Amino acid sequence: ATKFPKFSQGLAKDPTTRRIWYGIATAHDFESHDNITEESLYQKIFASHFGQLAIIFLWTSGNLFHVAWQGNFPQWVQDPLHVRPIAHAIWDPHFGQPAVEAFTRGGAQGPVNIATSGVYQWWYTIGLRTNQDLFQGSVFLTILSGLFLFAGWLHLQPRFQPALAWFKNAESRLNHHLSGLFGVSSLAWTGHLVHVAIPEARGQHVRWDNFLTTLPHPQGLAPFFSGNWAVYAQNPDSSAHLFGTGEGSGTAILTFLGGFHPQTQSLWLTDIAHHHLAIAVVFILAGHMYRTNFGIGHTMQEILDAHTPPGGGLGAGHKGLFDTVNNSLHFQLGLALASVGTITSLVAQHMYSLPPYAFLAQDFTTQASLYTHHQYIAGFILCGAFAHGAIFFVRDYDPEQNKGNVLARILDHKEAVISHLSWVSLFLGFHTLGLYVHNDVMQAFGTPEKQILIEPVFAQWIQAAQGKTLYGFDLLLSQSNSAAFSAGQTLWLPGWLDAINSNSNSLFLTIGPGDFLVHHAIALGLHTTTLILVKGALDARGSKLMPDKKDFGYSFPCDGPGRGGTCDISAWDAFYLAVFWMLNTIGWVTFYFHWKHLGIWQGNVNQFNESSTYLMGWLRDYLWLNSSQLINGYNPFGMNSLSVWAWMFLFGHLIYATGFMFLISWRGYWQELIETLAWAHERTPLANLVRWRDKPVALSIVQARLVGLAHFSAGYILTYAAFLIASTSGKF
C-alpha cells in the first residue's frame, strides 16, 4: 500500500504502525532487501562505508572547530596543569541567570562545557599550538569528508561500480591494507613526529611555510644513508626538559629511553617516533606476503588447506575455510569486531598506565572518562562480534562445504563447550560471591581479621618479573644479575624501572586481596557473557527444543507456548541477554578502575585496600561517599556547575527505569489497552473527524526487547558518566 519500506514489500503492505518501526529497524540489513544481488549488496556496503568515513571526519572537524572557536586552547597551552579545557560554548535560552554565572566559571567566554575527551592533550602533544592550527585542521577535515562523500557517490556510478571479483580479492586487499593503510600511514606519522611534533616539544616553531628549510636533525639524512643510525639516538631530552620550550631539550629524534617524561608524566616523543618507524617497517614487510599479479607470494587458500595436523586431531583442519570466510560477510564482520573490540580494550588498558599525551596523567577526569568510554565501546563491539558470528551460523554457514573442518568439529562438540563454560561461570560466581559475603559478614560482626583475603601472588610475581621490587620476588627484571636485566640495562630498563618502582604513576599499580576479588569478579563477568554469546551462536541453527531453528532466522520472537514454552529461544535473544551481562561486566571493570584511581589520586591508597574486600565497603565508600557533590549540583539553596551532572544523573536513572517497563510487561496487555484506546477515539465526537493511516498496535515482542534494552543501556551509560565525571571533577 504505502511506499516507505521500498526495500521490503512485506513491510510496505503492513497496515499498522509496525511498518514504520520495522522499516527503520531493517533498513541496513541489505541482504534481506527485496531483489538484492550479491554485487549490488557489496556496492551498497562500499558506498555506506564511504558515508561512515565522511561522518567520522566531519565529527573530528567539528571537535576541532568548536575548540578553536569557543575553547581556551592557547590559555591551556600556557598553563596545562591549572586550566580546565573548554569543549564548546553553551547557548540555552532556558537558562536562568545563576545557571549562566555557574557555567561561566568566572571566565569571559560565557557559559561553557569543560571537555573530558582529552583532545587538548593530544593536540598539544602532536604539535598544535594556536587556534589557527586547529581551524586549518578542521577545514581540511571538512574537505576530506566532502571528498569521501564524492567518492561514495562516484563508485555507485555504473562506470565506476566495482565488480564482485574486485570485492572478493582478499590477497590484494590484505597486501595493500597492511603495507599502505598501516605501514605507510605509520611511516608518515613518524615523519610528522620527527619534522613537527618533536621540534614543537622543544620550543621550535615548524609549520608548512618553513618545514622544507628546517632540519629535523642537525646532521640531516646523511647518518641514515651512511648506515650509521645511532646518531639519531644521541643526545636525547634530559630529565630537566620543559615541554614546549628549549630548556633541557636534546637533538635526538629516535630513542628507546622508556618510562615517562618527568614533567609531562607521559611517554617520550622520540620513543613514539621510533615505535611508529619500526611499526611502519614491520607492516610494510607484512604487506608483501600475499600473491597478487606478480607471481610471488602466498595464496591464503593454500595456507589454510595445508594446515591440517597429520594425526587427525583437527579432522580436515582448515580445509574449505577460505571459501567460508570469503563468501560470508558476517564471518568477516565477526572477526573484525572481535579484533577491534579487543584492540579497544587494549587501548583502554594502555593509555591509563602508559599515558602517551603530555599532561594527561594529571587530568584525572579525562583519564577516567577515556578508560570508561573505550571499555564500554569494547564491550558493545565484542557483543556485536558474537552476534554476527551467530548470524553467520544461521545465514551463511554451509555444512557440506565445511565437512569435517574446525568449524564443523566445534559445532559437533558444542555441548561440551557450553557445559564447560557453564561450569567455570558457576564456580567463579559461587566462590567470588561467597568470599565477598563472608568478608561482609566478618565486617558486620566487628571482626575484620576473620576475612578471607587471598593474596594475588601470581600477578605480583608477574609484576616482580617486570621489575617491581616491592613484593620481594627476585627474578628477571628485579634480579640485578639476571640476563634479562643486563640485556636491557643500557637501552630501556633505567626509565622502565624508574617508572615501575614509582608509586606516583599508574604503571603496574600495587595490588592486594581486593584486586584479587575484583579480578575474579571480572573473570566471572567475561566467562558468563561469553557463555551466553557462545551458546547463542552454537545453538543458532538448532537445539533439542527447536531442531529447525535455522529455518526461522536469526531474530524471531519465540516458537509459541507449546513444548513447554519457547520464550527468548532465538540467537538474537541470546545477544539481548548477553548485553545485560556485558554491561554488568564493564560496570565492574570501570567501578574498579575509578575507585582504585580515586584512592590513588586523593593520596589515600588504604581506602581501597581496606574497603574493597567487602561489598558494603564498595557501596558506602565508593557510591554513597562520592555522590555527595554530584547530587548537590542543585539544591534548595541554589545551584553550581555540577547541576547539569545531577540532572543527567536523575535522567539516566529515569531512562533506566523506563526500560524495565518494556522488559517486564509484555505485549498482550498493551495490545488490549490500545484496542480500548482505538475504540475510544472512534466513539469520541470532534475527534473521530481525524483518523489514523496506520492502525495503532502494540510494539512487537522482539521490538520490545530491543527498546527495553536500549533504554536500559542508555540509562546505565548516562548515569555512570554523570557520576564518574562529577565525582572526579568536584575533587580535582
Binding site: W229, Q234, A484, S486
Partner: peptide, 20 residues
Amino acid sequence: YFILATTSLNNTPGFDPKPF
C-alpha cells in the same frame, strides 16, 4: 641494513644489548 645498524649500536659507547 640490519648488519650496519646493529654494528652502529654496538660501536656507539654507552649501549650494550648483550645479556652479559
